[PDB]
């Protein structure tokens, strides 16, 4: 299947006292493999998946050095942004950055991306072609003129097209047992006699990986959205995911409703039917 490596940085200024909180997390696909948290005791990049613990002390030293230097650049950014937007020093503000690379099922480069937000809104982002920038507003415009005149995109492209993909491939190999493994949803249906005349059917998908999934109801072989409720996909806590979809149905008419489950771990879609 297809793969990605991504990093998510969050930096939150603390006007009361001290310096911004900085949190980095790294993922391969839907698997978090590292983190850093500037409030934690280690002051190190730490492992969050067993396969990355196979990297030796040199790796942990280098990832720690880079992540601490990144936290500092975000600290500077928060100060500059406060000025671009004419804000007081009294308020807390948030920078977010996410960047990463995709590779197809043959592991060849598909695309890279870098996105930046201030206070929860788009600020500046790299274009698909990794060659220029998109600014959301006139502050981000100031940043974009700077970064274009200094050809900052070339380095981002060098990383996203280059080192990101090569290390992604290295993790895919090292963590094969899990990263290249698909866990199909474990599915079943429950039945809740709502009231005298109407029943709720709930179609469950459990312990699946990766998170991407589609759950769909049909009535008599046609899609049905009316009287349907679909919860947001949610972490089980052990690295897999959960989701359900429900329909309200006339009591005694359960048999005409089917639940259809699509997922990468499934050779064919599953069909569930209450009998």
């Amino acid at each position: 299947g297809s793969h990605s490596m991504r990093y998510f940085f969050t930096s939150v200024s603390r006007p009361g006292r001290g310096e911004p909180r900085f949190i980095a997390v790294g993922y391969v696909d839907d698997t978090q493999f590292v983190r850093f948290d500037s409030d934690a005791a280690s002051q190190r990049m730490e492992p969050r998946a067993p396969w990355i613990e196979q990297e030796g002390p040199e790796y942990w030293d280098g990832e720690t050095r880079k992540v601490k230097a990144h936290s500092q650049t975000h600290r500077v950014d928060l100060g500059t942004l406060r000025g671009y937007y004419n804000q007081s020093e009294a308020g807390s503000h948030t920078v977010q950055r996410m960047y990463g690379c995709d590779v197809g099922s043959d592991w060849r480069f598909l695309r890279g991306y870098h996105q930046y937000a201030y206070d929860g809104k788009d600020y500046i982002a790299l274009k698909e072609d990794l060659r220029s920038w998109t600014a959301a507003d006139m502050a981000a415009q100031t940043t974009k003129h700077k970064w274009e005149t200094a050809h900052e995109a070339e380095q981002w492209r060098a990383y996203l097209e280059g080192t990101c993909v090569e290390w992604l491939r290295r993790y895919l190999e090292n963590g094969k047992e899990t990263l290249q493994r698909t866990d199909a949803p474990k599915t079943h249906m429950t039945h809740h006699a709502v009231s005298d005349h109407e029943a709720t059917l709930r179609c469950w998908a459990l312990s699946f990986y990766p998170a991407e999934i589609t759950l769909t109801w049909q009535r008599d072989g046609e899609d049905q959205t009316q009287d349907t409720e679909l919860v947001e996909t949610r972490p089980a806590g052990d690295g897999t995911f959960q989701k359900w979809a429900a329909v309200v149905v006339p009591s005694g008419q359960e048999q005409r409703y089917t639940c259809h489950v699509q997922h990468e771990g499934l050779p064919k879609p599953l069909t569930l039917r209450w009998e």
């Binding site: 880079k66 990144h70 671009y84």
Partner: peptide, 10 residues
């Protein structure tokens, strides 16, 4: 593997 410390500030 993180990128090196090459990002410019905004």
């Amino acid at each position: 593997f993180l990128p090196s410390d090459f990002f410019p500030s905004v």
